[PDB]
From a paper:
The last two steps in this pathway occur through the activity of penicillin-binding proteins (PBPs). Class A PBPs perform both a glycosyltransferase activity (GTase), which polymerizes the lipid activated precursor molecules into a growing PG strand, and a d,d-transpeptidase activity, which catalyses the cleavage of a d-Ala4-d-Ala5 peptide bond of the acyl donor and subsequently crosslinks the d-Ala4 carbonyl to the primary amine of a diaminopimelic acid (DAP) residue on the acceptor (in Gram negatives such as [name]), resulting in a d-Ala4donor-DAP3acceptor crosslink. In all, the modelled regions span residues 82–98, 100–207, 212–236, 267–297, 286–542, and 547–798.
Here, we determine the near-atomic resolution structure of the 83 kDa class A PBP from [name], [name], using cryogenic electron microscopy ([name]) and a membrane mimetic. Both before and after particle subtraction, the transmembrane helix was only observed where it packs against the GTase domain. Despite the expected broad structural conservation of the apo [name] in comparison to previously solved MoeA-liganded structures, significant domain rearrangements are observed between the two states. The TPase domain and the UB2H remain as a near-fixed domain dyad, but with an ~40° relative rotation of the GTase domain with respect to the fixed TPase/UB2H pair (measured by UCSF Chimera11).
Residue numbers in the entry: 82 to 98, 100 to 207, 212 to 236, 267 to 279, 286 to 542, 547 to 798
Write the structure that this text describes.
């Protein structure tokens, strides 16, 4: 009964079938002649779209770099607009911009050169069962040149059934005749043990192609197939990131082993033997971008519905920006250890969210001080208290009443006591000796007593109505005199949507991460359109966004205006009582960034809002090239000058402040 027993056990493991996976792409870049991008700014964009920089390109996906230009072979892609193939373009640069996109094939010109998006990850529900015809032709021939399976039957049983010399040996004898030799290797190449990551087993050539190179197995270069085949006798000995000198002498060994049965000449060998390890030089992950992909799967469940379970072969198009995500992670993993050691802190975390200024598309996300971990997303689940970051919504309600509240209205700065008895004290405990401060020196310096004296005069039923227009949920707003100073609990994904209505000029655009979902045959299952609803007046969201340029240049965030004085950042620094949380919401010409820095156990941190999330931010700016903030004044905004006593004057004045007025002759009445 031995023969009958083993046969039934074989079919048990062999069965379990397959389907295709769904691919998740990033955003699409469109290169254009005379566009603001440098050569070193262009190599960091291609290297983030998974473009191997080689010294002699021969296969789609490789780009070389030259004197003052960049040659490249754009890999084929099926764009939602049209279907395109290879393109050999030579991007000639002109210093700080892009001159020409001459097509190398016939020295033609290009109107605008489209770039294929990057593959974030593949999702199946890993199934990843590429059939016997989905593997390259030089892959089986490279596995046979180093594993003659004209030998392959025993190797299958060792990986499949084992992690018993009698069982597996008898297993191989009955598997050889019962199954065809083309059904054998199809099960082998999809089950080989090729590496170990943490506690998860990297099995198969499909799943090991994405793990090591981040690209489908049908696109492996012949020097990358030799590395992946040379690591069948590897498994945490011959793998890179540990011994990237031993995987290399095994890579070259398989090449000269597979050039014996001639399929590579000496010119091709010296070419391939010189290319370094093509592995993604960051550390492969089984499930990459876990913080962002939580926002996508949530967006897929809501926007599609019950069809989210039948995603087979569909291409998913997101708004993920890869250059901004590399700079967001590079600042969290390298900034948090620099804050912990200086204050002798035991733990410390972070979260960073980047959205587009005018459209609300999410470009980056970081869930913690180790963004490549999984299990807790602090940018979507950590509900912290915003603190001093809730003043821009008090002054945005004052400034939306231009008949009575301007940038020079005098606010009282006297000791106050209310009934929640409550008596706020300034964040530095100092009081103005004149007894009053203007409405611009109150937000620039982030004063606590004037903000209450201004917030109590408007009434909380009005400061609450502003918070709802900005896009916070009605259930988080509990109206008490402490809300004015930031007794508000919001996740970094709700603070980024609040400061996006101020940054765009009042146009509330709902944050999104799905661009479009195209089925496998060409049918469009979902196509996103902008909403961009109007919330606050464009003249009140400019006077607030102007004052937020003073809180960066000479205000509480002046330490940024001394480092990037050309960008003209706008940003509010957030502090709390005893520094439980510290934020920094900063705005530049293109994106809104929200940073949080605090301890998960809710204890004090010793970090001040100008040294916590603000120091993580001035790293995020250094890891890329930001766009300057240029505020264009809307209609009816007219600059007027004030004298010493804070009155409008006809000409001169010791200070110039914008004023929302349709008849700038208000100074004629206030001069007299």
């Amino acid at each position: 009964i031995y023969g009958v027993y083993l046969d039934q056990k074989i079919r048990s493991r062999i069965d379990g079938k397959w389907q295709l996976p769904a691919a998740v792409y990033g955003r699409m870049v469109n290169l254009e002649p005379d566009m603001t991008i440098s050569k070193n700014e262009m190599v960091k964009l291609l290297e983030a779209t998974q473009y191997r920089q080689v010294s002699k390109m021969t296969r789609p996906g490789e780009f070389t770099v030259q004197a003052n230009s960049i040659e490249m072979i754009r890999r084929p892609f099926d764009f939602p607009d049209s279907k395109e193939g290879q393109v050999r373009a030579r991007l000639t640069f002109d210093g700080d911009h892009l001159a020409t996109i001459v097509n190398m094939e016939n020295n033609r010109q290009f109107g605008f050169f489209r770039l294929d998006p990057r593959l974030i990850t593949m999702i199946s529900s890993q199934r990843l069962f590429v059939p016997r015809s989905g593997f390259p032709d030089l892959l089986v021939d490279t596995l046979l040149a180093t594993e003659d399976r004209h030998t392959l039957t025993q190797q299958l049983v060792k990986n499949l059934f084992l992690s018993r010399k009698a069982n597996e040996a008898y297993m191989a004898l009955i598997m050889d005749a019962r199954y065809s030799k083309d059904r054998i290797l199809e099960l082998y190449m999809n089950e080989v043990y090729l590496g170990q990551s943490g506690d998860n087993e990297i099995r198969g050539f499909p799943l090991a192609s994405l793990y090591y190179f981040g690209r489908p197995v049908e696109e492996l270069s012949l020097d990358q197939q030799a590395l992946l085949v040379g690591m069948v006798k590897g498994a945490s000995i011959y793998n890179p990131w540990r011994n990237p000198k031993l995987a290399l002498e095994r890579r070259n060994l398989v090449l000269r082993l597979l050039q014996q049965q001639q399929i590579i000449d000496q010119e091709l060998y010296d070419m391939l033997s010189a290319r370094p390890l093509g592995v993604q030089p960051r550390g492969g992950v089984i499930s990459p971008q876990p913080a962002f992909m939580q926002l996508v799967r949530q967006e897929l469940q809501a926007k599609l519905g019950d069809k989210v379970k039948d995603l087979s072969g569909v291409k998913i198009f997101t708004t993920f920006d890869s250059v901004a995500q590399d700079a967001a992670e590079k600042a969290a993993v390298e900034g948090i250890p620099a804050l912990k050691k200086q204050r002798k802190l035991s733990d410390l975390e972070t979260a960073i969210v980047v959205v587009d200024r005018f459209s609300g598309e999410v470009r980056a996300m970081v869930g913690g001080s180790e963004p490549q971990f999984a299990g807790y997303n602090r940018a979507m689940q950590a509900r912290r208290s915003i603190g001093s970051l809730a003043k821009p919504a008090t002054y945005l309600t004052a400034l939306s009443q231009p008949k009575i509240y301007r940038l020079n209205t005098w606010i009282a700065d006297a000791p106050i006591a209310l009934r929640q008895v409550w008596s706020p004290q300034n964040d530095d405990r100092r009081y103005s000796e004149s007894g009053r401060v203007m409405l611009v020196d109150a937000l620039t310096r982030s004063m606590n007593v004037p903000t209450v004296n201004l917030g109590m005069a408007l009434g909380l039923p009005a400061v609450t109505e502003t918070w709802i227009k900005l896009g916070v949920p009605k259930d988080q707003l509990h109206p008490v005199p402490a809300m004015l100073l930031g007794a508000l609990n919001l996740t970094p994904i709700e603070v980024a949507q609040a400061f996006q209505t101020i940054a765009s000029g009042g146009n509330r655009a709902p944050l999104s991460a799905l661009r479009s979902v195209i089925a496998e045959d060409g049918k469009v299952l979902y196509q996103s359109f902008p909403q961009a609803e109007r919330a606050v007046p464009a003249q009140a969201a400019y006077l607030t966004l102007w004052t937020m340029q003073q809180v960066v240049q000479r205000g509480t965030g002046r330490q940024l205006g001394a480092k990037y004085p050309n960008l003209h950042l706008a940003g509010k620094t957030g502090t709390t009582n005893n520094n439980v949380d510290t934020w920094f919401a900063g705005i530049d010409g293109s994106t809104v960034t929200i940073t949080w820095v605090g301890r998960d156990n809710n204890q004090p941190t010793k970090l001040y809002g100008a040294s916590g999330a603000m120091s993580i931010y001035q790293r995020y700016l250094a890891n890329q090239t930001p766009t300057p903030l240029n505020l264009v004044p809307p209609e009816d905004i007219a600059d007027m000058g004030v004298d010493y006593d804070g009155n409008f004057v006809c000409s001169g004045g010791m200070r110039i402040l914008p004023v929302w007025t349709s008849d700038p002759q208000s100074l004629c009445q206030q001069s007299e």
